[PDB]
Amino acid sequence: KETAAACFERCHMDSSSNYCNQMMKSRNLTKDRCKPVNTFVHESLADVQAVCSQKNVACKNGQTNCYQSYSTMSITDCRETGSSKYPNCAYKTTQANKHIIVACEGNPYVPVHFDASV
Ligand SMILES: [Hg+2]
Ligand SMILES: [Hg+2]
């Protein structure tokens, strides 16, 4: 199996052949389905992992293992278009600098879900 931490890295780390279409396919998000929404983070792995000891915040789901980054980070939001359907997944690409919120788990205590950005 792929671990939770490995899944996070494959889906979220990136330290109409548009970027989203390309990367969602490369990273095996859209080889076998079309995923509605995915964010990639253009920062070092280690700088993202460092968010797990930053500001503790509630997760959308009410758990309290989420952490918001002090700094805004370069991110690309990929969101499916209205007509997108498998196998021809189609994405809108939106680049932004925003604080990230990740859920953290394990020893070492590392990101395991991308909760949001703000
Ligand atoms: Hg995952
Ligand atoms: Hg994943």
Side-chain angles (χ1 to χ4, degrees), residues 24-99:
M24 297 284 284
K25 181 163 192 161
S26 171
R27 296 295 190 83
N28 187 34
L29 283 84
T30 60
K31 285 190 168 177
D32 74 347
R33 86 207 63 179
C34 303
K35 179 180 195 197
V37 186
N38 190 66
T39 306
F40 298 102
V41 185
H42 313 290
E43 299 293 343
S44 78
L45 181 54
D47 291 355
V48 179
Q49 287 172 328
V51 180
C52 288
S53 56
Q54 297 179 26
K55 202 61 205 211
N56 183 218
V57 297
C59 301
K60 256 223 156 141
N61 69 5
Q63 299 183 170
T64 44
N65 62 319
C66 290
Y67 299 85
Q68 179 168 315
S69 66
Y70 297 114
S71 68
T72 57
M73 287 181 176
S74 176
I75 70 186
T76 307
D77 292 301
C78 298
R79 183 171 281 254
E80 268 187 280
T81 72
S83 56
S84 174
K85 91 191 263 294
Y86 192 81
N88 309 107
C89 304
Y91 287 90
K92 184 170 181 49
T93 299
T94 307
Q95 177 56 219
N97 288 314
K98 302 276 69 107
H99 302 91

Side-chain angles (χ1 to χ4, degrees), residues 2-15 23 27 29 38-41 43-46 48-49 108 110-114:
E2 193 183 39
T3 64
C7 189
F8 176 93
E9 285 158 339
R10 174 175 58 78
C11 291
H12 307 295
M13 289 307 306
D14 182 25
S15 300
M23 194 58 75
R27 296 295 190 83
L29 283 84
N38 190 66
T39 306
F40 298 102
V41 185
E43 299 293 343
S44 78
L45 181 54
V48 179
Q49 287 172 328
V110 292
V112 296
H113 305 293
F114 193 90

